Design a protein around this ligand. Structure first.
Ligand SMILES: CN1CC[C@H](C(=O)O)[C@@H](c2ccccc2)c2cc(Br)ccc21
Length: 134
């Protein structure tokens, strides 16, 4: 498994636990409803150690870029400003966020040709499955 194999445009086909993960983050109702109903595409690009992830939908689009292994300020969809680090480790892209004494991890991995995105904060989890599209 390599970080490059995650590259491309992917479209959301299934979600579980997302609303509860947003509740654990303390996301307010406006943003939770938009999350309930955006069916985004996730676009992953990686050039050596440079990574960009763009999550795109008519409701909401976010994008960040980083260097793998280097701490950076991420503005999240819900407007947190986190200190994030992304690494490709044990065959998954692991995005670790720390802010105001709190932490959350988002992992992205290939499983059976699908992109599986898993979020966790304080044992509250979400799992989102994306299929590779043109
Ligand atoms: C870190 N991600 C992972 C989960 C979601 C995804 O990429 O499918 C993502 C998101 C972004 C734009 C539109 C809908 C959902 C999201 C939304 C939010 Br409100 C908080 C974190 C978060």
């Amino acid at each position: 498994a390599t970080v490059q194999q995650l590259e491309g445009r992917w479209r959301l086909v299934d979600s579980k636990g997302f609303d509860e993960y947003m509740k654990e983050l303390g996301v307010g109702i406006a943003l939770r409803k938009m999350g309930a109903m955006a069916k985004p595409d996730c676009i992953i690009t990686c050039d050596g150690k440079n990574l960009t992830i763009k999550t795109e939908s008519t409701l909401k689009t976010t994008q960040f870029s980083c260097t793998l292994g280097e701490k950076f300020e991420e503005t999240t969809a819900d407007g947190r400003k986190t200190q994030t680090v992304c690494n490709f480790t044990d065959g998954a892209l692991v995005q670790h966020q720390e802010w105001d004494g709190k932490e959350s991890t988002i992992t992205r991995k290939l499983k059976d040709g699908k992109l599986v995105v898993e979020c966790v904060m304080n044992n509250v989890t979400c799992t989102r499955i994306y299929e590779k599209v043109e």
